[PDB]
Design a protein around this ligand. Structure first.
Ligand code: HEM
Ligand SMILES: O=C(O)c1ccc(C2CC2)cc1
Ligand SMILES: [Cl-]
Length: 393
């Protein structure tokens, strides 16, 4: 009853151009079986949304990668939020929600905006830049480690560690194995900075530790929640901003609409998150036998959700393959949906908004003017190098 497919959604050929295979995955049926990895997959919007919003059956505490924590040791101690179910999930989630709250955004907005403006002006002086190293990576590196309250020393480990985290959600392919092998120095660096003495007062890290006073988290929980921010909080924004710039480079008409109304910056970023879906995939594990898409899935089965596919499903989206900065983007699943929906979404959107605002006000044209290279990661979609010429407004 369930179609079996041989598509490897973690192969380099798939990362290189996922969209035809994602259609094949959607059109095969509401639920497929991926023989390459012995997992179920859901690629249409409806089922992906349903699974995300059914946490008691499609759980996270057995891992949101391919590995089942009931069967194998996690490569690092489980995340107290990503890899937890309610009720255990709830108070750590509440702490990060408060640390990354609307109120907190007021404290960092001016500096985040100023750094974005300054960066775009700097790049305009250079003219021909790499929109990944010089913009998508450089801008988040210039604000987020500081906002965390990290010391200067060791920050070169941040992106490698994130690359590892996101590769490690994948199957045990070469990408994952190469990432985990000799990763100890990255792990040691991150784990050390999660300890309270190493985090600057006023920053997100210190604020997490401050919540141990309230009874919401214990002191021994705080370093793991700092670890969550150091795992998710940088590389995501790199690929989100890179996605947006790549979109604006490919859709000059939309750059021009953005220029004409910079207040479209926030939605132009949201649309980029839908369109590229920097976080492509997550898994759940069934806690019980369950019928999904007329398919009966046993207990303890891994279910692969194709977030990017869901965000391009023509059943849900008009012209899914068009980048439209005035699209009603609400309901996209690029930040997830339900109890685990991205708790750092205000930080992500703030960064994206203020960079796209700076571009909107300062740049007339973005032209790809060198070889484009894709960055391969089991979970993250994005580019390694994006040479562009920036024309000033
Ligand atoms: C464009 C940028 C980002 C994207 C696309 C993204 C994507 C996602 C997605 C899809 C989830 C849901 C996970 C699931 O359902 O299993 C999620 C959760 C999460 N994200 Fe974001 N994220 C981004 C930025 C950030 C930032 C900037 C931070 C921190 C400063 C962050 C921290 C987290 C954390 C801690 C969770 C787990 C929340 C929970 O389990 O309740 N992410 N993110
Ligand atoms: O808690 C964590 O360590 C964690 C790691 C990666 C993510 C991805 C979704 C952005 C989220 C949380
Ligand atoms: Cl670690």
């Amino acid at each position: 009853t369930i179609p079996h497919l041989a598509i490897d959604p973690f192969s380099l050929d798939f990362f290189d151009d996922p969209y035809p295979d994602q259609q094949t995955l959607r059109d095969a049926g509401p639920v497929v079986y991926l023989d390459k990895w012995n997992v179920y997959g859901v690629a249409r919007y409806a089922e992906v949304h349903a699974v995300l919003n059914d946490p008691t059956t499609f759980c996270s505490s057995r891992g949101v990668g391919l590995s089942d924590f009931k069967k194998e040791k996690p490569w690092r101690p489980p995340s107290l939020i990503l890899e937890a179910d309610p009720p255990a999930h709830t108070r750590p989630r509440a702490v990060l929600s408060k640390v990354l709250s609307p109120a907190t955004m007021k404290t960092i907005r001016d500096g985040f905006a100023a750094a974005a403006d300054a960066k775009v002006d700097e790049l305009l002086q250079r003219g021909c830049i790499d929109a990944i190293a010089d913009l998508a990576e450089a801008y988040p590196l210039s604000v987020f480690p500081d906002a965390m309250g990290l010391k200067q020393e060791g920050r070169e480990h941040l992106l490698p560690y994130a690359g590892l985290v996101f590769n490690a959600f994948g199957p045990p392919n070469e990408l994952r194995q190469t990432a985990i092998e000799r990763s100890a120095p990255h792990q040691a660096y991150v784990n050390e900075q999660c300890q309270r003495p190493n985090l600057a007062p006023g920053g997100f890290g210190a604020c997490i530790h401050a919540f141990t006073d309230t009874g919401e988290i214990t002191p021994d929980e705080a370093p793991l929640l700092v670890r969550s921010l150091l795992s998710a909080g940088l590389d995501t924004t790199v690929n989100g901003i890179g996605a947006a710039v790549y979109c604006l480079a490919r859709f000059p008409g939309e750059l021009q609409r953005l220029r004409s109304d910079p207040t479209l910056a926030r939605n132009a970023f949201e649309e980029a998150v839908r369109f590229e879906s920097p976080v492509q995939t997550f898994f759940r594990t069934t806690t019980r036998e369950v019928e999904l898409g007329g398919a009966v899935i046993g207990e303890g089965e891994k279910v692969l959700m194709f977030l990017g596919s869901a965000n391009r499903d023509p059943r849900r989206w008009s012209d899914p393959d068009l980048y439209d900065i005035t699209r009603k983007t609400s309901g996209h699943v690029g930040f997830g949906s339900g109890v685990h929906m991205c708790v750092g979404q205000l930080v992500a959107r703030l960064e994206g908004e203020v960079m796209l605002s700076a571009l909107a006000r300062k740049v007339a044209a973005i032209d790809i003017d060198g070889p484009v290279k894709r960055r391969f990661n089991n979970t993250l979609r994005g580019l390694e190098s994006l040479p562009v010429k920036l024309t000033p407004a």
